[PDB]
Structure formats: C-alpha cells, structure tokens
C-alpha cells in the first residue's frame, strides 16, 4: 500500500474515540478532529487513486505528503495519555493546536475542490 501508512493510522486515532483515556471531553475533541480530516484525505487517495500517474503534477505529489508527515503529530494523540502520568497537564497553547488545525484546513482546503470537503 502506497498510502497504506496513513490508512493505518485511522484506528491509531479511533483508540482515543473509543474512550480509552484519562482526560476530559474537551480532549478528545483535538483527536476526533484529526481522524474526521485522515478519514477524508485517505478515502480520497482511494477515489482519486482511479486516475493514472499521469494526472499527478509537482504539487499533487506534496498534497499527499503532507497528509503523510501530518502521521508524525497523531503519536501526540496517543501520547496524550502518558502526559497524564507525567504530571504534565493539558493545554491550549502548549497543545499547538493553532499547528494542527491550520495545517489541516490547509489540505483540507485543497480537497474542497474535489467534492467539497467542508
């Protein structure tokens, strides 16, 4: 699977979906975000995927890219869990959530002009 690392990681995210995890609602909401955008974008390598090699110009190439980098920040959902242990405790601006969501809109926007991603 070409794009199967990022299909791999629809579950990764569901593990904090399911309410297996020591923190607020107001958590989870960071990693319910997340999968909602993957569970779009990875779909869509599925649709898409039906045209050839040919249709794929420079930036197609980075489109998906940075959909697979974004794999990099979901060990941050998970992680969120040992964090409690830690001491550390959950924060808006510590969380970078202004990182997650901006670089999220910013793909998701691309894909708006597919089918309307909203």
């Known amino acids: 699977s070409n794009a199967g690392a990022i299909a791999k990681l629809i579950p ?46 420079s930036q197609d190439k980075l489109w998906a890219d940075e959909v697979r980098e974004l794999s990099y920040v979901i060990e941050d959902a998970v992680d969120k869990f040992l964090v409690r242990v830690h001491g550390v405790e959950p924060d808006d601006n510590t969380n970078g959530f202004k990182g997650l969501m901006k670089r999220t809109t910013k793909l998701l926007k691309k894909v708006v002009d597919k089918h309307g991603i909203a």
Not at 14 to 20: R, S
Not at 21 to 43: F, P, Q, R, S, W
Request: aromatic residues 2%; glycine residues 8%; proline residues 4%.
């Open 12 to 57: 990764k995210l569901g593990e904090l979906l399911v309410g297996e995890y020591k923190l607020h609602k107001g958590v989870k909401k960071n990693i319910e975000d997340l999968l909602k955008e993957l569970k779009t974008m990875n779909a869509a390598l599925i649709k898409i995927g039906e045209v050839p090699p040919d249709q794929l110009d």
